[model samples]
Target chain A: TPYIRPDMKAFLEMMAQVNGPKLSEMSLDEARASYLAMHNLADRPARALPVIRDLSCPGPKGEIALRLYDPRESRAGPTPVITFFHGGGFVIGDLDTHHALCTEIAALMDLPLVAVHYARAPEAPFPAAILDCEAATRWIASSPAELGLTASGIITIGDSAGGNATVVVGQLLAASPAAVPVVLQVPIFPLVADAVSSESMAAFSEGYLLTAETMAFFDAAYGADRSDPRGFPILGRHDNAPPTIVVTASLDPIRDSGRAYAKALIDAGRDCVFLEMRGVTHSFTNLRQMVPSTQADLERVIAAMQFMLANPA
Target chain B: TPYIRPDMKAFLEMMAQVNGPKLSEMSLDEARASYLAMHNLADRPARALPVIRDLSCPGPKGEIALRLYDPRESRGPTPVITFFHGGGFVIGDLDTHHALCTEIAALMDLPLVAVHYARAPEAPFPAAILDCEAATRWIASSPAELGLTASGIITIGDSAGGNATVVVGQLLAASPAAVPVVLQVPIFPLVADAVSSESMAAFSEGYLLTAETMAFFDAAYGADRSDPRGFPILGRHDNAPPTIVVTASLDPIRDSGRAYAKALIDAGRDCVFLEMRGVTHSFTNLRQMVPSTQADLERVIAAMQFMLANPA
Candidate 1:
């Protein structure tokens, strides 16, 4: 175990001892509750950041629940905007799942952060989450003044499955000439399935906390259509991808997905930088408090964002 | 995927980019050199600790090259350890894993002697096993002249060396007071035959150590599939020594060691299983440079120490 940290080791040992329903054994509702409980057990107490206010954004289906946090730096005027997406294999996550992270990133980067509570899977599957995220992103970019933001300066960020949404949203925006120019998109450990044949998937098939079985469950729940570029970002053409920072975990089963995406963007002549954190598993950003290195990793993300925002590459 | 730590990730990425000769494509010498280079690159800068001294003990063939590391903790009389190194039963020497032995000896507060056995293909199946067992028996039975205690001897090894350690304990299981061994630390042991498990099939292909290479080593050892000594799982599981079995999440032989541990537990023998997450094979040999690997080794030794301290 070359990459497991002491704290992560402790957490894993605790998890092994905990008698609970496995993702494969439980109902979707039970799985969601179990996932939330596990995260809450590992998560640190939330620090007070800028008060996040609930807001509504026009969506393709209906009003999407969005939480907007003004920067702690206290800018009364227009500010750069960040649209954040939470990840739960596109089946579970909501506003509350990534609440602490949204607030933390806003406070750290001092930017107006908008977190979208998109539709989930096993009910709304595939294009449902994609449409909600894209609609909210478009709405925020179009009505920047209403949210006290600049129309020109917008970036998107997401983790794990939500990271897939970030890529889709970025691609959608890049294709639309009338849309606000997105400065950059930071997708951390995004799940982009191009047929899970990677060595990581095979090697870490079991006992690495997240199993292949759980991923298969997520894939099935989301009706993962590999043919659709929007559903499988790695399958899509990368020419339209924006300036991007792709973060991946070395030990994650879907590690190659994010790595392949970054490589494709670079190969396609799109401005891109891939940061693959060693010795870490998937969801390093969300487990920031539990894994100390994650805080450092998140700082690197913020720094990359600030650099990209300033340079507009 | 979850157990992979950050350093391992960076190392793996770098390794993936480096185009190297495959073990299946190289001579034994070339493969050994290539393996050494990769390990040296990943190994942590060597830290100064208790200096290891070379010595020899009586073996089945002749005098075996034994490297001894005395504890620096200043114990007037320290507990002794017999360590076996892993190299898939084909390659590796005392120097390849000296750093690990040094740290473990200091941490476990015991003197460690690493035994060098006959290499395979030339010596064939039973030669290496015979050398290891002979050396272990001699050390445990030797008086203060060998700097070991007959009452507190413990055996430790990783991978193929770990497999040998298990065989030694099993051979000594029926012997009455011929040795002073108390517990066994066989980490990620290779006890399965050529017909590997589904895990070996899934994990053996592209992992650092290929399944093909494992089969090659087995052939070099010149053991038939029915040899119970080579296939320790087929041996008597009931009378085996108390054990601490360690398995790596990303390794092919993970299932074998884990199965052995479960067998021990099921047989009503004392056993503890530690599944080191996010690691592939042979990190136990690279502990000095890898914090997680070192942490795992420390924990395993600590568990061994506790078991020895309070025997059930």
Candidate 2:
């Protein structure tokens, strides 16, 4: 009721009239389909980054699907790699879910971006997604000789649940130092804890779009033991955490979850810049069209991210 | 932060990371958007009941947006639930509490009516209470078009709505209406002084609701904190109806709910208190995302039913 943006208010009212069934009430296939469709409807047409190619990487189970891209048509010698994990609560998201977002980030930031299609939950629950994400990040960091790319350093970033992976991956790599260290890590609207409850969970549960039912669905589908540090990254050791720029949306369900990770970093005396976009929802990175102002917000996040990288911690 | 659930802890942490700017710092339009969007995003989907539609009745300034809901398609004569929303007399509207309203009607199996009062930095003090009173009066009449018949009224709301519930009870007590207030439920309300509360300062920041936001809401509403009608705690509670005061332990306004419930019991009025262990304010609206809060909400409805069946 406070000052909600005109467009955001319009969208919320419109969605209310739609009165669609909750995501928890939908089929898993339909839920996944709608998420992709929702992102596509909200995002601008994907940009054609030069190095757009499908590639495979070694994984814990089998080969992991990866998309490699860069702003330029071709890259020179050694370049810092932007490794990404897409957010979908590890239940619905795939490489396709965040294609446009990754495409936009790669197009705007001049770097080789590797988007990992980590195995999702319900089928590959708990450590599966994190393990797959870690495998891909480590593989990309080792300087794949045949892939024609070298990571002078690793810059990790992601949104929503995968945003949790961004931090988890950093901790995993830092615990056993990588030859190419994660110089910068950006966790956006991350799920650092189980997210069963909180001020944001309690207050912004409705009308912000990430309903409790959907979160419950994701939580159950991504079934991780509550005690494991792999699933809930907040429980992990932050002593060896990386320099990070954590991003969150005020209206996001997991906004504070991302904040906790940032708090963890700051408490550890690690370099950190928290960029929280006011008046925006959790998936603003994808919903640039629905919430146009978020485009500016994303740019700011990218700007913060790039600056943190240029002056690597 | 003690004994808080794991998931809720994660939720608080992420909201912290987002570090959403204060309502005082942003455009008022964005502030409301921020509030509504926050509510719309975090809460669960609205349940489809047999009866849910918008209605309007004469208000102090103009007609008000009065939404009607019920579990049954048809009911003869029963008490109606008059609900209001919480936004500190600033942000929030009919849509803001639509899902919660629907759930209450479904759970309690009673007709629930929500009033959309004039908000501030514009309408300011008295406008909301006047509109709320006017809407409650018109609703108690049981308008023929919306298809309801009220022998009595049950008043309810959270935050600002909770404030209105207490104020309207005072107004109606002075002059009896056709349908008397049978029961009242004020959830996480600030019926007493807000700015100078113990819990308010302890959780002034990073708990989602902050002291700065409340200060801005107070100034914008332009209410006299010392006035009986402003804080309503100074108002007479002798005629207060059977009541249920809900609170969340982590809410900045937890002390407020505590004070109101205690005032009722001390005044020899029938009342029961329920506080969700470790959640924050706005827990009712956040039933879906918070998961366990769904139980918190259900308990509220169950308690209301118990009180209604076993009158004071």
All models: lDDT? 0.73, 0.80
In model 1, how large is the Cα lDDT of residue A118? 94
The clash numbers for all candidates, in the given order, read 14, 46
Which stretches of candidate 1 lie above 4 Å from their native place?
A73-76, A144-146, B1-312
Task: Give a tens-digit lDDT track for model 2, residues B58-88.
Answer: 8778789888898887787898999999998
User: Candidate 2 at residue B103, lDDT?
Assistant: 88
Of the candidates shown, which would achieve the greatest TM-score relative to the real structure? 2
Query: What DockQ class does candidate 1 belong to?
Result: incorrect
Worst 10 residues of 2 chain A by lDDT: A265-274
Candidate 1's TM-score:
0.50
